[PDB]
Design an enzyme around this catalytic site. Structure first.
Site, mmCIF file in Angstrom:
data_model
loop_
_atom_site.group_PDB
_atom_site.id
_atom_site.type_symbol
_atom_site.label_atom_id
_atom_site.label_comp_id
_atom_site.label_asym_id
_atom_site.label_seq_id
_atom_site.Cartn_x
_atom_site.Cartn_y
_atom_site.Cartn_z
ATOM 1 N N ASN A 1 5.377 13.774 -7.083
ATOM 2 C CA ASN A 1 4.225 13.380 -6.294
ATOM 3 C C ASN A 1 2.928 13.935 -6.902
ATOM 4 O OD1 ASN A 1 2.671 13.698 -3.161
ATOM 5 N ND2 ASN A 1 3.389 11.734 -4.035
ATOM 6 N N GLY A 2 2.971 15.176 -7.369
ATOM 7 C CA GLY A 2 1.815 15.780 -8.013
ATOM 8 C C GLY A 2 1.315 14.963 -9.194
ATOM 9 N N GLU B 1 10.181 1.302 -12.604
ATOM 10 C CA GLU B 1 11.556 1.724 -12.889
ATOM 11 C C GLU B 1 12.285 2.095 -11.599
ATOM 12 O OE1 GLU B 1 11.153 1.600 -17.306
ATOM 13 O OE2 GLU B 1 12.577 1.045 -15.715
ATOM 14 N N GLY C 1 0.538 13.530 1.169
ATOM 15 C CA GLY C 1 1.511 13.739 2.228
ATOM 16 C C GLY C 1 2.713 12.792 2.149
ATOM 17 N N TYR D 1 6.628 1.701 -23.571
ATOM 18 C CA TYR D 1 6.679 3.155 -23.674
ATOM 19 C C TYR D 1 6.377 3.688 -25.084
ATOM 20 C CZ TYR D 1 8.941 3.316 -19.026
ATOM 21 O OH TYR D 1 9.222 3.201 -17.680
ATOM 22 N N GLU E 1 -2.296 12.797 -9.594
ATOM 23 C CA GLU E 1 -3.212 13.034 -10.705
ATOM 24 C C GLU E 1 -3.401 11.772 -11.531
ATOM 25 O OE1 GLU E 1 -0.802 16.165 -12.274
ATOM 26 O OE2 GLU E 1 -1.742 17.742 -11.076
ATOM 27 N N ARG F 1 13.364 -1.072 -10.021
ATOM 28 C CA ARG F 1 14.513 -1.585 -10.789
ATOM 29 C C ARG F 1 15.832 -0.840 -10.580
ATOM 30 N NH1 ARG F 1 11.849 -2.049 -16.808
ATOM 31 N NH2 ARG F 1 10.300 -3.685 -16.394
ATOM 32 N N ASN G 1 0.814 -1.215 0.000
ATOM 33 C CA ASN G 1 0.000 0.000 0.000
ATOM 34 C C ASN G 1 0.849 1.268 0.000
ATOM 35 O OD1 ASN G 1 -2.893 -1.223 0.623
ATOM 36 N ND2 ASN G 1 -1.451 -2.210 2.036
ATOM 37 N N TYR H 1 7.119 -5.156 -13.973
ATOM 38 C CA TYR H 1 6.317 -4.288 -14.831
ATOM 39 C C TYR H 1 4.803 -4.395 -14.589
ATOM 40 C CZ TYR H 1 6.439 -1.102 -18.835
ATOM 41 O OH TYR H 1 6.342 0.010 -19.654
#
Ligand code: 0XE
Length: 259
Positions: free
Chosen positions: A137-138, A173, A11, A119, A142, A176, A6, A76
């Protein structure tokens, strides 16, 4: 029945992100093959399907939650759950298709994408390149909303694709590469989002080659150097596993390890 890690972006701190990525690695490995101090992921061949995946449950500031499925053989993302829907990347070997039917078996609605998770497919879908997609983090916060609201029809596919790109890089990634984990910790520490520089993208592009070069190396020595890039795009040659020890955390399995 699959293990669950989790993580909340709301925050999030260097420490909570670090703990999350260490826990992810922890679940992907043992698999106790370590080649030159670098853990190797389990060979898929002969791998019991009950040990094939782990679940990463992400929740955000909007109190939305999505659970990603990770293939333990390559770290992945193969698909995700949001509420009563599950979405999978189009597989590309019938063993995969087999394996994923054991994922999210309780959900009402299960959809498979036309596209795969690479990708290249994702970048066109998003109409942007990795180097033009901010991470931090933003963006992850989103990305989680975007993934959730797709299960309800409120998310455009290019936004979805961008969301996969953000997630895969900040989870897969990062698991990894300690280097990429480091890059994300830094963005989190200063609450700055930014697109990945060339050092990050070339590491991502070269993960398979790196794993092969290390496991085929003569006592750690590469028969032929691998070219990577610095933060500023200038290229440099890697000749030896030693310099990669603090860069790469996991490798994809390649052949048996020589005795
Ligand atoms: O690095 C390479 O030279 C080539 O390697 C290929 O990828 C693999 C190579 C591999 O090479 C070896 C190998 C190579 C030399 C000696 C013993 C073993 C073992 C693998 O399990 C292995 C693998 O699983 C790969 O996916 C790629 O398919 C191919 O594109 C690439 O050219």
């Amino acid at each position: 029945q699959y293990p669950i890690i989790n993580f909340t972006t709301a925050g999030a701190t260097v420490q909570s992100y670090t703990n999350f990525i260490r826990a992810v690695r922890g679940r992907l490995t043992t698999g106790a093959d370590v080649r030159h101090e670098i853990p190797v992921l389990p060979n898929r061949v002969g791998l019991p399907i009950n040990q094939r995946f782990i679940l990463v449950e992400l929740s955000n500031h909007a109190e939305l939650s999505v659970t990603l499925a990770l293939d333990v053989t390559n770290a992945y993302v193969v698909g995700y759950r949001a509420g009563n829907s599950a979405y999978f990347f189009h597989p590309d070997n019938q063993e995969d298709a087999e394996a994923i039917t054991h994922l999210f078996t309780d959900v009402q609605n299960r959809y498979t994408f036309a596209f795969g998770g690479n990708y290249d497919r994702l970048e066109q879908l998003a109409g942007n390149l990795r180097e033009n997609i901010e991470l931090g983090n933003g963006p992850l916060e989103e990305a989680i909303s975007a993934l959730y609201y797709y299960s309800t029809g409120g998310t455009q596919l290019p936004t979805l694709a961008r969301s996969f790109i953000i997630c895969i890089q900040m989870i897969s990634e990062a698991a990894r590469f300690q280097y990429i984990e480091g890059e994300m910790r830094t963005r989190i520490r200063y609450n700055r989002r930014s697109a990945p520089d060339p050092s990050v993208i070339t590491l991502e592009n070269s993960w398979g080659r790196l794993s092969t070069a290390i496991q085929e190396s003569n006592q750690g020595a590469f028969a032929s150097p691998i070219q990577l890039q610095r933060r500023n795009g200038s290229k440099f040659s890697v000749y030896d596993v030693s310099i990669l020890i603090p860069i790469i955390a996991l490798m994809v399995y390649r052949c048996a390890p020589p005795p």
